[PDB]
């Protein structure tokens, strides 16, 4: 039903998760960028990225909360929905440890699918803990994460992408990490999110062992190095994620404007650092609104 030139060729109607699978296959590698809101998703789309990301940490911090697992399915879901309403670019969503036991995880998968989300990642961290527990990083046993994956796979559609994230590497080293990852794939993970993988020549071994597409997480200000997308792909990596990059720059920029207005009683010095009205109207595709009204009405 879709055309190429004047030639009517087969095109399959593509669901969010299939668009994502397709973006992985067609890119080398797929760069996925963090976006904290619909407008950022549009900036990313306009720059020409083929997939976007909703960070768990970002959702919390944007609420003015620490990334301590205070947020729930609704906090993430509402931000996801806002983004998928604005763009069909496949969206990857951080759902932490699933927000509870088997049926919470099921509800999260279904709600994410109803929100037109393309993929989620779920982590093998310890969840909930005691009331007064101090912040930190603990892994669950492989079997506890297997159960989480099964709860998810049990209700997902075929197209929808479950990415199991492991933080084993920093704590248990490369061998034990590869072991979990393989167990996670066997339990039904579609892909793997390798967190904090240091030396790039460990990638080919990691990727070859796990078989499914692997995502490398390019964070800042942590204890992991920054390689290029090309380098990571040459070492067998299929996705590269930039989770918080843009929002760290948005923050510094907003702080700078606030300080200018405070210090100078006016924002004149900030004008050069601001997006122009015209770029804004363009990213919002404002003209298509006027054009739609002319197409249909008066």
**Alpha-helical runs (H) found in the chain:** 16-26, 38-47, 56-62, 73-86, 102-114, 142-155, 168-187, 203-210, 229-234, 245-264, 277-283, 287-296
Which residue, 25 or 255, has its beta carbon nearer to Cl ion?
Answer: 255
Are 89 and 41 in contact, with CB atoms under 8 Å apart? yes
Confirm whether residue 72 is marked as ligand binding.
no
Site size toward its own copies, by CB under 8 A:
119
**Single residue of 67, 111, 147, 282 touching Cl ion by CB under 5 A:** 67
Would you list the DSSP string of 186-210?
HHT-SEEEE-S---GGGHHHHHHHH
Are 190 and 146 in contact, with CB atoms under 8 Å apart? no
The interface mask with its own copies, positions 78-117, x = CB under 8 A, is x--xxxxxxx----------xxxxxxxx-x--xx--xxx-
Which residues contact residue 263 at a Cβ distance below 8 angstroms, ignoring those fewer than 6 apart?
Answer: none
Residue 128 site contact among Cl ion, its own copies, none (CB < 5 to 8 Å, cut-off depends on kind): its own copies
**Single residue of 215, 218, 237, 239 touching its own copies by CB under 8 A:** 218
* Residue positions counted in the chain: 298
Distance, CA of 213 to chain centre: 15
Which residue, 5 or 48, has its beta carbon nearer to its own copies?
Answer: 48
The interface mask with its own copies, positions 5-34, x = CB under 8 A, is --------------------------x-x-
Site for its own copies in 37-56 (CB under 8 A): 37-44, 46-49
Q: How far is the CB of 154 from Cl ion (least distance, A)?
A: 21
Confirm whether residue 188 is marked as ligand binding.
no
Site for its own copies in 165-184 (CB under 8 A): none
> b/e per residue, 279-288, with b = 16+ CB within 10 A?
eeeeeeeeee
Angular region, 99: left φ>0, alpha ψ -120 to 50, beta rest: left
Omega before residue 131 within 30° of 0, cis? no
**Single residue of 25, 28, 66, 133 touching Cl ion by CB under 5 A:** 66
Confirm whether residue 195 is marked as ligand binding.
yes
Residue 267 site contact among Cl ion, its own copies, none (CB < 5 to 8 Å, cut-off depends on kind): its own copies
- Stretches 62-70, 74-82, 98-106, 261-269: which one binds Cl ion (CB under 5 A)? 62-70
Q: Angle CA(48)–CA(52)–CA(57) in degrees, nearest 5?
A: 140
Q: How far is the CB of 223 from Cl ion (least distance, A)?
A: 15
Residue 266 site contact among its own copies, Cl ion, none (CB < 5 to 8 Å, cut-off depends on kind): its own copies
Which residue, 6 or 36, has its beta carbon nearer to its own copies?
Answer: 36
C-alpha–C-alpha distance, residues 187 and 181, integer Å: 10
The interface mask with its own copies, positions 223-252, x = CB under 8 A, is ---xxxxxx----------x--xxxxxxxx
Under rule CB under 5 A, residue 202 binds Cl ion: no
- The distance in angstroms from the start CA to the end CA of the chain is 31
Confirm whether residue 98 is marked as ligand binding.
no
Residue 107 site contact among its own copies, Cl ion, none (CB < 5 to 8 Å, cut-off depends on kind): its own copies
In the complex, the residues that contact Cl ion under the rule CB under 5 A are 66-67
Q: Which residues are annotated as a binding site for Mg(2+)?
A: 67, 94, 96
């Amino acid at each position: 039903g879709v055309d190429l030139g004047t030639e009517n060729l087969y095109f399959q109607s593509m669901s969010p998760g299939k668009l994502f699978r397709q973006a992985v296959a067609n890119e080398h590698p797929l760069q996925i960028v963090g976006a904290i809101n619909a407008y950022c998703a549009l900036l990313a789309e306009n720059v020409g990225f083929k997939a976007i990301y909703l960070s768990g940490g970002g959702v919390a911090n944007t609420l003015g909360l620490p990334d301590l697992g205070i947020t729930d399915l609704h906090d993430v879901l509402e931000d996801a929905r806002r983004i998928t309403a604005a763009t069909h670019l496949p969206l990857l969503v951080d759902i932490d440890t699933g927000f509870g036991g088997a049926f919470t995880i099921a509800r999260a998968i279904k709600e994410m699918e109803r929100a037109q989300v393309a993929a989620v990642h779920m982590q093998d961290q310890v969840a909930q803990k005691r009331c007064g527990h101090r912040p930190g990083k603990e892994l669950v046993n492989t079997n506890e994460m297997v159960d989480r994956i099964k709860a998810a796979v049990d209700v997902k559609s075929n197209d929808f992408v479950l990415i199991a994230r492991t933080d084993a590497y920093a704590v248990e080293g490369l061998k034990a990490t590869i072991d979990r990852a393989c167990t996670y794939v066997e339990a039904g993970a579609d892909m793997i999110f390798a967190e904090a993988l240091e030396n790039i020549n460990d990638y080919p071994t990691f990727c070859k062992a796990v078989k499914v597409p692997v995502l490398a997480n390019m964070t800042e200000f942590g204890k992991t190095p920054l390689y290029t997308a090309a380098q990571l792909a040459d070492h067998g990596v299929k996705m590269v994620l930039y989770p918080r990059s843009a929002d760290r720059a948005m923050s510094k920029a907003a702080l700078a404007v606030y300080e200018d207005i405070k210090k100078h009683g006016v924002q004149t010095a900030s004008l050069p650092f601001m997006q122009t009205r015209e770029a804004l109207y363009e990213v919002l595709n404002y003209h298509a609104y006027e054009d739609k009204l002319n197409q249909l009405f008066k």
